[PDB]
Amino acid sequence: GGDLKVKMLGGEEILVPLRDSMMVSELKQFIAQKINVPAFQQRLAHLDSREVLQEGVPLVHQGLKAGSTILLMVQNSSATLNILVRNDKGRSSSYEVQLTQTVAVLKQQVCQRERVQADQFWLSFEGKPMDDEHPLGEYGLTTGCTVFMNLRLRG
Amino acid sequence: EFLNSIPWEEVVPGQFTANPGFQVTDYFEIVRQPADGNCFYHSIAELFVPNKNDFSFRLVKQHLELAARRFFEEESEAKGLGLSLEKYLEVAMCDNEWGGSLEASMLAKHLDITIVIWVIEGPSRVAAAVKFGPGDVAGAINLLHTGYNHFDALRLLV
């Protein structure tokens, strides 16, 4: 394998072991445990093609080997974004949030916008329920993603 | 049919949602159930048990006691409650206890059936629809969520 080179902010280089045929999630987790930044707050890209580093593919046929670098971008201004959250009726409103804050904040926001209680609904994204205590970015959010609001339907 | 011709978006595996805008009585027959706190199990026993009685509901909760040990610790809705299986069953099996989407999903996965909850807002217009199971709507156990605190049975019309 060797040692891959990551170039952060275009003004520093960090070395990382090159486990042949390994995923980008472990790369982001390595950098995360190395510089104490969350994985969802990292964006990795190529040098000169400016193309998106595909996820779920081993960076092998993607054309990567030791001695080649990759650019890294950190995002905690803290930045903001906005998602579409769908009511149980279907009227998905727009909520601007941040990946750093907890899901309880988003739940209270949905409460104040729907005038409904907190214990009576839960959020979901892409076939999995969202935990309250965990951060938002751990669920892979992006602008325009439709987070579902599901009522307890207790009657 | 118009009921097999429905768009269902998947929320989690075993749970679909939709928002059809129409009136219930146009297709369904609303069998009203008592408001003793067990109207969900009453409306289930109306469609699922031969020769239903006001106390034929208890039997249905029996089935829940299996599914609770089968899917509660693995149900997508149960996460974030802060209650174990025992804290759950101590009150959920207690008489005159409400029942909602969690029990419907656990019973649909337990009984190899398909529970469809038709929630209506306003006097008689459907606001949303939640479906636990993959089965047909004509052959499903159709429930009606009048208000936000009651359940009635929905017999399918010929």
How many CB atoms lie under 10 A from the CB of residue B68? 23
Contacts of B100 in chain A (CB under 8 A): 152-155
Contacts of B147 in chain A (CB under 8 A): 155
DSSP conformational letter for B157: P
Q: Which of A126, A24, A123, A68 is nearest to B10 (CA)?
A: A126
Residue B130 phi/psi, 5° resolution? Answer: -120, 135
Alpha helices (H) in chain A, listed in sequence order = 24-35, 103-114
Report d(CA B126, CA B41) in Å as an integer. Answer: 21
Report d(CA A106, CA B112) in Å as an integer. Answer: 35
Q: How many domains does chain B have?
A: 1
Q: Which of B133, B17, B13, B108 is nearest to A126 (CA)?
A: B13
Shortest alpha-carbon distance between residue B105 and chain A (Å)? 11
Q: What is the resolution of this structure in A?
A: 3.2
Report d(CA B65, CA B68) in Å as an integer. Answer: 5
Q: Which of B37, B97, B43 is nearest to B68 (CA)?
A: B97
Residue B69 lies in domain: 1-158
Task: Kindly state the tokens that stand for B113.
Answer: 């059936």
Query: In this complex, is the C-beta atom of A155 within 8 Å of any C-beta atom belonging to chain B?
Result: yes
Obtained via which technique?
X-ray
Task: Kindly state the tokens that stand for A67.
Answer: 């001695």
Q: Find out whether B65 and B92 touch, Cβ atoms under 8 Å.
A: no
Shortest alpha-carbon distance between residue A106 and chain B (Å)? 15
Asked whether the beta carbons of residue A155 and residue B98 sit closer than 8 angstroms, the reply is yes
Contacts of B102 in chain A (CB under 8 A): 152
Amino acid identity for residue B153 in this structure: A
Report d(CA B151, CA B30) in Å as an integer. Answer: 10
The CATH number of whichever domain residue B40 belongs to comes to 3.90.70.80
Which residue is it, tokens 């727009």?
A94
What are residue A14's DSSP bridge partners? A6
Report d(CA A94, CA A83) in Å as an integer. Answer: 6
Task: Kindly state the tokens that stand for A52.
Answer: 């998106």
C-alpha torsion sign, points A130, A131, A137, A143: positive
Q: Which of B33, B8, B22 is nearest to B144 (CA)?
A: B33
Tell me which residue in A89, A122, A148 faces B77 most closely, judged by beta carbons: A122
Q: Which of A104, A92, A81 is nearest to A146 (CA)?
A: A92
Burial B71-110 (b: 16+ CB within 10 A, else e): bbeebbbbebeeeeeeebbeebeeeeebbbbbbbbbbbbb
Q: A3-74 maps to which CATH number? A: 3.10.20.90
Q: A81-151 maps to which CATH number? A: 3.10.20.90
Which residue is it, tokens 């459907």?
B126
Query: In this complex, is the C-beta atom of A115 within 8 Å of any C-beta atom belonging to chain B?
Result: no
Domains A3-74 and A81-151 share a fold: yes
Residue B74 phi/psi, 5° resolution? Answer: -120, 5
Residue of A nearest to B102 (CA): A152
Which residue is it, tokens 């990292």?
A42
Asked whether the beta carbons of residue B17 and residue A155 sit closer than 8 angstroms, the reply is no
Amino acid identity for residue B142 in this structure: N
Contacts of A127 in chain B (CB under 8 A): 10-13
- Sheet arrangement for strand A146-151: A93-97, A81-86, A146-151, A121-124
Where do the domains of chain A lie?
3-74, 81-151
Between residues 29 and 88 of chain A, which touch chain B (CB distance below 8 Å)? 88
Report d(CA B54, CA A70) in Å as an integer. Answer: 69
Report d(CA B108, CA A68) in Å as an integer. Answer: 54
Report d(CA A140, CA B72) in Å as an integer. Answer: 26
Residues in chain B: 158
CA atoms within 13 A on the CB side of A17: 7
